[PDB]
């Protein structure tokens, strides 16, 4: 199928850095880490699958932002 199917193992090379909520050469965050742009040269199927995988990355980034921001600011003991 290789000759008849074109798409960018290379994804798995740069995927761990994106999963940990960090910028990547092929995946870039924007708008205060609220959306992630899937590049060109990722055909329909792979993009549709990644949209499910990238849910973890964005959610974890949001949680890390919250933890880093409210680490020692809140006064209430419960929070």
């Amino acid at each position: 199928i290789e000759p008849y199917y074109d798409t960018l193992q290379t994804i798995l090379t740069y995927l761990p850095y994106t999963m940990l909520g960090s910028d990547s050469k092929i995946f870039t965050f924007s708008n205060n880490y609220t959306r992630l742009e899937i590049p060109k040269d990722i055909n329909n199927s792979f993009s549709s699958l990644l949209r499910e995988v990238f849910e973890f990355a964005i959610l974890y980034k949001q949680l890390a932002i919250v933890v880093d921001r409210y680490k020692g600011t809140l006064v209430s003991a419960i929070k």
Binding site: T13, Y14, Y17, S22, D23, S24, K25
Partner: protein, 100 residues
Amino acid sequence: PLLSQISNLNIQQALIIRELLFTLLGHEGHYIQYSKRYDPTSQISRIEGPDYKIAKNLDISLKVITKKLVKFGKFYSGLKSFIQVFDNNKFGKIVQKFCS
């Protein structure tokens, strides 16, 4: 070797790790250098620790990860310079015992 000349990711990672081991102790490296704002003469500059700039040719992901880790060298250098200033008789037993 120039950082731009190297294109492989593994080589860049190993090089930055080798340079980072010394950076975490407050020393300069070949690819991590002190910011021009850091003046060792000023007391407050030494206490607050030096700020580091990363070479522009590093990979973006490695640059981000390094920018997170660099802060540990800043804290260590600041504490080491704190001991060499606040550990004398004029600052009292409380501050001396804290320096311990």
